[PDB]
Amino acid sequence: GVPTYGAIILDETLENVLLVQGYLAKSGWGFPKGKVNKEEAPHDCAAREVFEETGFDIKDYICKDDYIELRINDQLARLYIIPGIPKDTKFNPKTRREIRNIEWFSIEKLPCHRNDMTPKSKLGLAPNKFFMAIPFIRPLRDWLSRRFG
């Protein structure tokens, strides 16, 4: 798998995160991110994907050491952490064939796992519209705890 790069944007209170909603296979909510182009540096990919999906430019705010990275089915996803972006910021995707909507969510209200179906004696997990975001939530809470307290 080709690696993906993007950002976790937080507001000034550190309470809220910016998610984007896609279409079809990507119909639910996730952090803004996408696949790296040939010979493109990780920080340049993250700024390009975030600007395409939100219309906000992170280039002057990226810190090279501040990121969460996960490997999911042998594909690497690295999201740079960008705190302190005001909630009254005007966001507008470029790529509206790809992005349905953009919204702020409370970090403490987001799920960090999907629910089983043990009440139905059935295997697997119940659908959840935050499925693409969920793997990063626990690592994000732990990162904010260590850096800020």
Side-chain angles (χ1 to χ4, degrees), residues 1-34 36-37 40-63 65-89 91-119 121 123-145 147-149:
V2 174
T4 59
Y5 298 99
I8 291 167
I9 290 159
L10 299 104
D11 67 337
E12 66 268 64
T13 72
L14 312 169
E15 277 171 306
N16 301 294
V17 288
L18 191 77
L19 305 181
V20 297
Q21 186 180 31
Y23 289 112
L24 303 167
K26 294 174 164 162
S27 177
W29 290 95
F31 295 99
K33 62 178 185 57
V36 62
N37 291 326
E40 179 177 45
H43 71 273
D44 292 325
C45 176
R48 181 186 48 84
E49 297 283 354
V50 174
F51 185 77
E52 289 176 4
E53 299 178 18
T54 70
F56 181 81
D57 186 356
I58 64 168
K59 153 172 54 73
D60 290 336
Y61 302 116
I62 290 174
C63 300
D65 296 309
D66 291 346
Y67 63 76
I68 284 155
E69 183 182 69
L70 298 182
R71 187 193 56 215
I72 295 168
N73 297 319
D74 235 80
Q75 195 181 2
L76 193 91
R78 178 191 293 176
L79 301 177
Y80 293 91
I81 295 158
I82 313 291
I85 303 315
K87 285 188 300 295
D88 63 354
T89 302
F91 295 109
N92 288 108
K94 306 300 156 174
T95 55
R96 258 227 116 178
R97 287 174 147 81
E98 322 183 53
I99 301 293
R100 193 194 291 277
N101 202 355
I102 301 171
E103 284 184 21
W104 290 101
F105 294 86
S106 168
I107 297 162
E108 72 176 11
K109 289 190 173 171
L110 289 170
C112 66
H113 63 78
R114 296 145 80 209
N115 294 334
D116 62 44
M117 294 176 305
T118 57
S121 283
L123 305 189
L125 292 165
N128 190 292
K129 66 182 192 186
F130 299 108
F131 69 100
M132 297 176 283
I134 277 164
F136 298 90
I137 304 301
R138 180 62 42 194
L140 174 67
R141 290 176 179 154
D142 293 345
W143 192 104
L144 293 170
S145 285
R147 160 79 48 107
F148 298 102

